[PDB]
Design a protein around this ligand. Structure first.
Ligand SMILES: Nc1nc(=O)c2nc(CNc3ccc(C(=O)N[C@@H](CCC(=O)O)C(=O)O)cc3)cnc2[nH]1
Ligand SMILES: Nc1nc(=O)c2nc(CNc3ccc(C(=O)N[C@@H](CCC(=O)O)C(=O)O)cc3)cnc2[nH]1
Lengths: 557, 557
């Protein structure tokens, strides 16, 4: 019945963004176009509306992701659209995808089916240059670190302690571990380093946490790149790179106006990793949306154990936001995997594995309650789901205390989300939220980790390797112990063990390593090995990709 | 140099309490005397002052108790006294001791040395009859449970499910496990039960948590005594015992006015266990003190892991109190035991075991911070403590962020607490508190236990026996899962293992059993075996006790 994703995006009729912008009260002079259907928007908009009250803030999140798929963005856009149809003044804020995936695994829609922000092609690729700006802001510091050594090493860095890597927005595994500065006294200082994907760059994180260009610059100045032979820290400030980086980011600091299929305005801006970073779109975009609109839908990376958690405990913390509702997105299928059913038999009805798996969802609902935010569940409808199945899922959500709404936004655009929209509105008019972060900053790193781990993961306790112990000891005496904590762990489990589906009990977390992003302003415990630069597959999507004389692009999606 | 405790109490000159009472603004008609030096005070005092603002609330607590002793009450009274000397309008609120200990181990001062509430003799013994009233309110329900069975068992209790024991205020071990109702159809219904010491009676708990006689009566009506053969709960309400119990407690519901050696007014009122109950004096006394005074000192049973915790999470919760400071009482000696030094070598200087043991204190200080209450440490001075020792202890407290003050109240009454008083005043004028309970009631019992366990005990996780699992399951479906949780565990460790002194790491808590006090309004997880009716020793203190023709009492203290 439904057309594929890509073709739906092309045949959509989009409105001139300048139109959308004046519709929202943005003045033409605060708009810088990129074609007819993209625009950067001035940080001045926010500045003149600082005093106006915020609209409502609605977070989208989901249950523990599985191979079976949940489609969280699909829901976000479709929720946005329904809200627009019900006459509400709404925007959606989303993250910019990394360019690289478009060539290994394939690019995919911002959403999918009929729930999508457009123009699709651009947003996957260069969009408005935000990631390029991030790439060169980042690598300029790399080159300045290297130039400093080359020029007599005045700050007295021990080159072997350098933590500041390089970045690029392609999936290139060979760039993981490299030795640079070879060739002789004229070619720099030989040393071991590597590349991570640009979207995992701390500079990408900063962008998303910054309040403006001047706040962004000040963060840059706090970036720790490595240490002295004495074990004193060396920062970008010390290298005096901030102005430059800040300059490279002058256009990057502005959110980008675009639209859903059905022309609902949308910001797309920033887009960090959700394991080593907070997996949220920029504070700047979102804070602007609240001024321009009465309702703002936004989402978070990975399951609610991670994105939701970081959204509240980091994003809202810094921005002084107080989310008003949270929507958890789930499917019958993912729940059944969590209840034990293998990927190939997900089609066979099975109310028992569905009841078993529901625990995963029950535990997320519960977590969101721990932040004082009322929770609505979205069920991404799927054709093989039986009535018995869906019904059970309703009973179970109600038993567990949350409104539930079946969503067919994928299939039917904004119309497939109208009951969901109504449930959210219903929750907003009758269950105002009592926001508070899960933890105070004045705790210790180990206190902060344990509270997340036990309150959110349902972990028994936390383990630490010797290397992690010295890190935390070091970081605390360097005065970074009153920072937020950002768990990088698997997203496929509440546990640090990705094989443990559903709601695992009697387990512990092992923190193996602890890293720092003093620019972004947080501490990063890592549990498994974390892949900050994925590789291409056996056949890369790039082998099929072409564009012909007409400009007809095949093999891409 | 110093006289013993008892003789100090006798030679003290006490003022007529009616005097103290009019001094505080209590009208004569709100006073019922018991001699010249005791009075019950009307709940009407509070009622007419409900609108006045509260004075400051200052909690006294201590580090993990050891065989070496810490003297927490000594500090409380002496702190009260210093405050009085500095011209401040202050009262102290303390618990009534159990009568029984006076005959096994020996009675002891309310405080000690020169820091004491008087008249000593009375407060150990019958005082004003509060515990007797508790004993008979309690046992009337026992006798009504038994009468009900005898009279045809209309409510259809399964006598073997009866949880409501009997109580008495002596240490009588033989009364632990008994079979009653023997002799035949005319003598009641044969069944297994026992006695606990009166001060561990739930009715004692209720008294301390009640807001008035009518609130107290309503609590009584919610007491669960046992179940039906169907597994439905049976309450005192169902037995219609509340009015009666409420009647037995008509005088008991009034706090008792008494004084310190130096004539500072003092309430003594209620006095529950601190493991299966919250180890605090009555809300009623304390709430009245805040109206009558600008500063109120009160204390809590056991270490800060227990009393302090329950004081905040139960007492302040119910009463809507917001403590303004908390004083932790410690000694060089107890810290050294915690650092490893055996009881016999506590006299030998040892800065290393003192540094090691300080961890215990550091961890308590830290906990009190988790409730948003600024912490001052009191050092009970002891003659064998060296300058090097005390100095180290100061450096360590300051390093750990809390004011510290050496206290010689034992030796020198109110004068030995003047620096401490000044430090508290100093903390009150410059570090206002941000009170919040450790946890929300809407969590699950297992969530609530784990948060206490991990945040306060520094436990890894929590274990549960099968019997505890069904209890919690039962209690939750009976609708008692949104109640406070009251840990009964050893007081000699942060862990449930009393052999683990100092600051134990990598341990778990095992909850073996879970009980309910639906009158008092909380849930009682138990970890070790909990002794709710201690025994007399080899030689009981009672074998030496006498009073002669003059009335000279020997052998008692
Ligand atoms: N990737 C992907 N995601 C999708 O969401 C998706 N959806 C469809 C078609 N959508 C659907 C969704 C739900 C039902 C369904 O469950 N129908 C019930 C609704 C039950 C209720 O209202 O409670 C029915 O009564 O027909 C059928 C088709 C096809 N391919 C997809 N592919
Ligand atoms: N059970 C009991 N408790 C006590 O508190 C107690 N105190 C004394 C006598 N009190 C004390 C207390 C402290 C110092 C002491 O440490 N003196 C130091 C003060 C150090 C400082 O100010 O930092 C000194 O300089 O003399 C001496 C005697 C005797 N028996 C007791 N018995």
């Amino acid at each position: 019945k439904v057309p594929s994703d890509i073709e739906i995006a092309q045949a959509a009729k989009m409105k001139p963004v300048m139109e959308l912008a004046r519709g929202l009260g943005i003045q033409e002079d605060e708009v810088e176009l990129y074609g007819k259907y993209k625009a950067k928007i001035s940080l001045d908009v926010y500045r003149r509306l600082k005093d106006k009250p915020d609209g409502k803030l609605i977070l989208v999140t989901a249950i523990t992701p599985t191979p079976a798929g949940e489609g969280k963005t699909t829901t976000s856009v479709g929720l946005t659209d329904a809200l627009a149809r019900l006459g509400k003044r709404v925007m959606v804020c989303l993250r910019e995808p990394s360019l690289g995936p478009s060539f290994g695994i394939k690019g995919g829609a911002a959403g999918g089916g009929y729930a999508q922000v457009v123009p699709m092609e651009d947003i996957n690729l260069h969009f408005t240059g935000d990631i390029h700006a991030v790439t060169y802001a980042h690598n300029l510091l790399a080159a300045m670190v290297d130039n400093h050594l080359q020029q007599g090493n005045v700050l007295n860095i021990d080159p072997r302690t350098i933590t500041w890597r390089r970045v690029i927005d392609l999936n290139d595994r060979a760039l993981r571990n490299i030795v640079i500065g070879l060739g002789g006294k004229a070619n720099g200082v030989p040393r071991e380093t590597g590349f991570d994907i640009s979207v995992a760059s701390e500079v990408m994180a900063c962008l998303c946490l910054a309040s403006d260009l001047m706040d962004l610059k000040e963060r840059f100045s706090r970036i720790v790149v490595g240490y002295t032979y004495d074990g004193k820290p060396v920062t970008a400030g010390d290298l005096e790179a901030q102005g430059s980086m800040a300059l490279l980011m002058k256009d990057a600091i502005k959110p980008n106006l675009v639209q859903t299929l059905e022309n609902t305005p949308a910001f797309i801006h920033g887009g960090p990793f959700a394991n080593i970073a907070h997996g949220c779109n920029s504070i700047i975009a979102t804070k602007t949306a609240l001024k321009l609109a009465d309702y703002v839908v936004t989402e978070a990376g990975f399951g609610a154990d991670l994105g939701a958690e970081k959204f509240y405990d980091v994003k809202c913390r810094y921005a002084g936001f107080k989310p008003d509702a949270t929507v958890i997105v789930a499917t019958v299928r993912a729940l059944k995997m969590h209840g034990g059913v293998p990927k190939s038999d997900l089609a066979t009805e099975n109310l028992e594995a569905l009841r078993e798996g529901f625990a995963n969802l029950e535990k997320h609902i519960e977590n969101i309650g721990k932040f004082g935010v009322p929770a609505v569940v979205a069920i991404n409808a799927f054709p093989t789901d039986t009535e018995a199945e869906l019904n059970l899922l309703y009973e179970l959500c109600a038993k567990a205390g949350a409104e539930v709404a079946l969503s067919e936004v994928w299939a039917k655009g904004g119309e497939g989300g109208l009951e969901l929209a109504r449930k959210v509105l219903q929750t907003l008019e009758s269950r105002p939220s009592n926001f508070h972060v899960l933890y105070n900053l004045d705790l210790s790193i180990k206190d902060k980790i344990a509270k997340i781990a036990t309150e959110i993961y349902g972990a028994d306790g936390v383990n630490y390797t010797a290397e992690a112990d010295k890190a935390i000891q070091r970081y605390e005496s360097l005065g970074y112990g009153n920072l937020p904590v950002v768990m990088a762990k698997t997203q496929y489990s509440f546990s640090d063990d990705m094989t443990k589906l559903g709601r695992p009990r009697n387990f512990t977390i092992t923190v193996r390593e602890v890293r720092l992003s003093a620019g972004a302003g947080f501490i990063v415990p890592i549990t498994g090995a974390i892949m900050t630069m994925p590789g291409l597959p056996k056949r890369p999507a790039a082998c099929n990709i072409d564009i012909d004389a007409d400009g007809v692009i095949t093999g891409l999606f």
